[PDB]
Scaffold this active site. Structure first.
Site, PDB file in Angstrom:
ATOM      1  N   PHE A  60       0.878  -1.229   0.014  1.00  9.62           N
ATOM      2  CA  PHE A  60      -0.023   0.077   0.028  1.00  9.62           C
ATOM      3  C   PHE A  60       0.778   1.112  -0.025  1.00  9.62           C
ATOM      4  O   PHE A  60       1.769   1.318   0.883  1.00  9.62           O
ATOM      5  CB  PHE A  60      -0.765  -0.104   1.429  1.00  9.62           C
ATOM      6  CG  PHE A  60      -2.285  -0.915   1.123  1.00  9.62           C
ATOM      7  CD1 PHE A  60      -1.744  -2.430   1.370  1.00  9.62           C
ATOM      8  CD2 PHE A  60      -3.427  -0.759   0.807  1.00  9.62           C
ATOM      9  CE1 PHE A  60      -2.803  -3.222   0.973  1.00  9.62           C
ATOM     10  CE2 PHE A  60      -4.208  -1.605   0.695  1.00  9.62           C
ATOM     11  CZ  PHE A  60      -4.133  -2.905   0.736  1.00  9.62           C
ATOM     12  N   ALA A  61       0.512   2.115  -1.046  1.00 10.07           N
ATOM     13  CA  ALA A  61       1.192   3.362  -0.828  1.00 10.07           C
ATOM     14  C   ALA A  61       0.336   4.784  -1.194  1.00 10.07           C
ATOM     15  O   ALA A  61      -0.092   4.806  -2.170  1.00 10.07           O
ATOM     16  CB  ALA A  61       2.274   3.279  -2.152  1.00 10.07           C
ATOM     17  N   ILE A  62      -0.170   5.002   0.063  1.00  8.58           N
ATOM     18  CA  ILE A  62      -1.127   6.111   0.355  1.00  8.58           C
ATOM     19  C   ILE A  62      -0.539   7.286   0.562  1.00  8.58           C
ATOM     20  O   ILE A  62       0.193   7.425   1.396  1.00  8.58           O
ATOM     21  CB  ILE A  62      -2.221   5.594   1.203  1.00  8.58           C
ATOM     22  CG1 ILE A  62      -2.873   4.164   0.932  1.00  8.58           C
ATOM     23  CG2 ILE A  62      -3.393   6.275   1.278  1.00  8.58           C
ATOM     24  CD1 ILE A  62      -3.614   3.929  -0.386  1.00  8.58           C
ATOM     25  N   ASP A 148       4.504  -3.973   4.385  1.00 13.00           N
ATOM     26  CA  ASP A 148       4.567  -2.251   4.530  1.00 13.00           C
ATOM     27  C   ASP A 148       5.570  -2.017   2.979  1.00 13.00           C
ATOM     28  O   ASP A 148       6.540  -2.656   2.557  1.00 13.00           O
ATOM     29  CB  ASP A 148       5.326  -2.086   5.753  1.00 13.00           C
ATOM     30  CG  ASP A 148       4.534  -2.035   6.999  1.00 13.00           C
ATOM     31  OD1 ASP A 148       3.437  -2.612   6.965  1.00 13.00           O
ATOM     32  OD2 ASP A 148       5.059  -1.399   7.780  1.00 13.00           O
ATOM     33  N   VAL A 149       5.511  -0.641   2.983  1.00 11.92           N
ATOM     34  CA  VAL A 149       6.061  -0.044   1.839  1.00 11.92           C
ATOM     35  C   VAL A 149       7.469   0.606   2.145  1.00 11.92           C
ATOM     36  O   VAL A 149       8.258   0.823   1.221  1.00 11.92           O
ATOM     37  CB  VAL A 149       5.161   0.941   0.769  1.00 11.92           C
ATOM     38  CG1 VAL A 149       4.816   2.289   1.570  1.00 11.92           C
ATOM     39  CG2 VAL A 149       5.556   1.259  -0.549  1.00 11.92           C
ATOM     40  N   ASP A 150       7.328   1.074   3.332  1.00  8.14           N
ATOM     41  CA  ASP A 150       8.340   2.002   4.143  1.00  8.14           C
ATOM     42  C   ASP A 150       9.928   1.062   4.159  1.00  8.14           C
ATOM     43  O   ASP A 150      10.206   0.928   5.402  1.00  8.14           O
ATOM     44  CB  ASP A 150       8.079   2.772   5.046  1.00  8.14           C
ATOM     45  CG  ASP A 150       7.427   1.751   6.320  1.00  8.14           C
ATOM     46  OD1 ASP A 150       6.828   0.968   5.947  1.00  8.14           O
ATOM     47  OD2 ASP A 150       7.926   2.290   7.285  1.00  8.14           O
ATOM     48  N   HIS A 170       8.607  -9.953  15.036  1.00  7.22           N
ATOM     49  CA  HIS A 170       8.735  -8.571  15.282  1.00  7.22           C
ATOM     50  C   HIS A 170      10.112  -8.202  15.827  1.00  7.22           C
ATOM     51  O   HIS A 170      10.546  -9.065  16.688  1.00  7.22           O
ATOM     52  CB  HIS A 170       7.870  -7.877  16.129  1.00  7.22           C
ATOM     53  CG  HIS A 170       7.803  -6.284  16.209  1.00  7.22           C
ATOM     54  ND1 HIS A 170       8.857  -5.669  16.612  1.00  7.22           N
ATOM     55  CD2 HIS A 170       6.721  -5.442  16.126  1.00  7.22           C
ATOM     56  CE1 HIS A 170       8.762  -4.411  16.482  1.00  7.22           C
ATOM     57  NE2 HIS A 170       7.372  -4.385  16.341  1.00  7.22           N
ATOM     58  N   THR A 182       3.262  -6.078  23.367  1.00  7.83           N
ATOM     59  CA  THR A 182       2.461  -5.193  23.346  1.00  7.83           C
ATOM     60  C   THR A 182       1.073  -5.308  22.698  1.00  7.83           C
ATOM     61  O   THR A 182       0.604  -4.886  21.668  1.00  7.83           O
ATOM     62  CB  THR A 182       3.049  -3.847  22.793  1.00  7.83           C
ATOM     63  OG1 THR A 182       3.424  -4.061  21.284  1.00  7.83           O
ATOM     64  CG2 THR A 182       4.293  -3.318  23.465  1.00  7.83           C
ATOM     65  N   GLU A 240      -1.914  -4.565  13.812  1.00  9.76           N
ATOM     66  CA  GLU A 240      -0.909  -5.503  14.314  1.00  9.76           C
ATOM     67  C   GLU A 240      -1.312  -6.364  15.240  1.00  9.76           C
ATOM     68  O   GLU A 240      -1.412  -7.593  15.518  1.00  9.76           O
ATOM     69  CB  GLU A 240       0.443  -4.982  14.630  1.00  9.76           C
ATOM     70  CG  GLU A 240       1.217  -5.761  15.024  1.00  9.76           C
ATOM     71  CD  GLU A 240       2.732  -5.102  15.256  1.00  9.76           C
ATOM     72  OE1 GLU A 240       2.973  -4.302  16.125  1.00  9.76           O
ATOM     73  OE2 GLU A 240       3.732  -5.166  14.218  1.00  9.76           O
TER      74      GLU A 240
END
Ligand code: BHE
Ligand code: UDP
Ligand code: MN
EC number: 2.4.1.40
Length: 291
Positions: A60-62, A148-150, A170, A182, A240
């Site tokens: 996703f690149a929003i 994720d895109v980042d 993670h 968490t 998550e």
């Protein structure tokens, strides 16, 4: 139906010699945990090529995150499933901002236009709904990988990951005890996990499996988020949190080590990681998430 493997010459596995002694390489439900040294990629490549496996990758690149696409896709071309059929699905609110990246043979990219939510939390959470909305997957790919895109690929990410259902450890929590995870701790949330439960803390940025299992997971997480929203509660770590609840109650058939989701700026390069495969691209969170 699966044909025979061809003759192959490779080092004999030794029963009285572990591949890795410093890490857990199989879960208590007998799912491999994928670390460098645990797999012969030549054997796995053969097995999956013989099935003419196609892998879908959703990303996703929003809004401002379109800036991350060029590095993401160019490094994916270098490292992700090379030699296999790949179909990228780029979900974006700005189709014209998708960079023209040159693709290797047998690899394609589809741009899917979607709406942009105002809050980064909603943008992140709505991925489950948007992945689940899509019916092309069953006809186009065998496996779906959702990331994720980042990020950027720095080393091999291949068919060793493929399995009916996988999550990724993670990087901040692989050595933590479960009480420190968490997870969502409010019983009012569908994502709730008590302090005495939990196998691992999985990263929302990298999960996948067969199309069937991924659509089950994303459907389940979306419906759980809808219930929470009706109840005026938003889980502490958004999608998550729900992913973690799902994978607690539906055990993944493989688990990826933190080689597969690392942040070197934050966490360095510890002895336990022989490779850093897919890594965070440094972000100014507040700046990049808002107008
Ligand atoms: C400095 C920021 C401190 C981040 C430490 C812990 O990590 C966060 O853990 C959370 C759950 O408890 C969420 O998974 C969050 O997405 C993650 O931060 C993400 O992944 C991390 C690996 C980093 O890349 C961070 O920059 C991201 O925002
Ligand atoms: O404005 C936004 C916020 C989020 N995302 C998508 O949602 C993912 C998760 O958000 P982010 O990477 O900011 O979360 P973090 O890894 O910092 O927890 C991103 O990788 C993008 O794919 C996006 O496209 N635009
Ligand atoms: Mn991210």
């Amino acid at each position: 139906f699966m044909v025979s493997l061809p003759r192959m010459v490779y080092p004999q596995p030794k029963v009285l010699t572990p591949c890795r002694k410093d890490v857990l390489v199989v879960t208590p439900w007998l799912a491999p945990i994928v670390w460098e040294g645990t797999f012969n990629i030549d054997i796995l490549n053969e097995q999956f090529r013989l099935q003419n496996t196609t892998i879908g990758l959703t990303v996703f690149a929003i809004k401002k995150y379109v800036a991350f696409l060029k590095l993401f896709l160019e490094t994916a071309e270098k490292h992700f499933m090379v030699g296999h059929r790949v179909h990228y699905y780029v979900f974006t609110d700005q189709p014209a901002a998708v960079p023209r990246v040159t693709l290797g043979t047998g690899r394609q990219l589809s741009v899917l236009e979607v709406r942009a939510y105002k809050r980064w939390q909603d943008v992140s959470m709505r991925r489950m709904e948007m992945i689940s909305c899509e019916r092309r997957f069953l006809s186009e790919v065998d496996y779906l990988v959702c990331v994720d895109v980042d990020m950027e690929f720095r080393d091999h990410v291949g068919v060793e990951i493929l399995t009916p259902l996988f999550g990724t450890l993670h990087p901040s929590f692989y050595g933590s005890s479960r009480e420190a995870f968490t997870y969502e701790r409010r019983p009012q949330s569908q994502a709730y996990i008590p302090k005495d439960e939990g196998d691992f803390y999985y990263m929302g940025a990298f999960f996948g499996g067969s199309v069937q299992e991924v659509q089950r997971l994303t459907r389940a997480c979306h419906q759980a988020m809808m219930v929470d929203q009706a109840n005026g509660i938003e889980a502490v770590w958004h999608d998550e949190s729900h992913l973690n609840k799902y994978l607690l109650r539906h055990k993944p058939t493989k688990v990826l080590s933190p080689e597969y989701l690392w942040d070197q700026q934050l966490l360095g390069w510890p002895a336990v990681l022989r490779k850093l495969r897919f890594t965070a691209v440094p972000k100014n969170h507040q700046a990049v998430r808002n107008p």
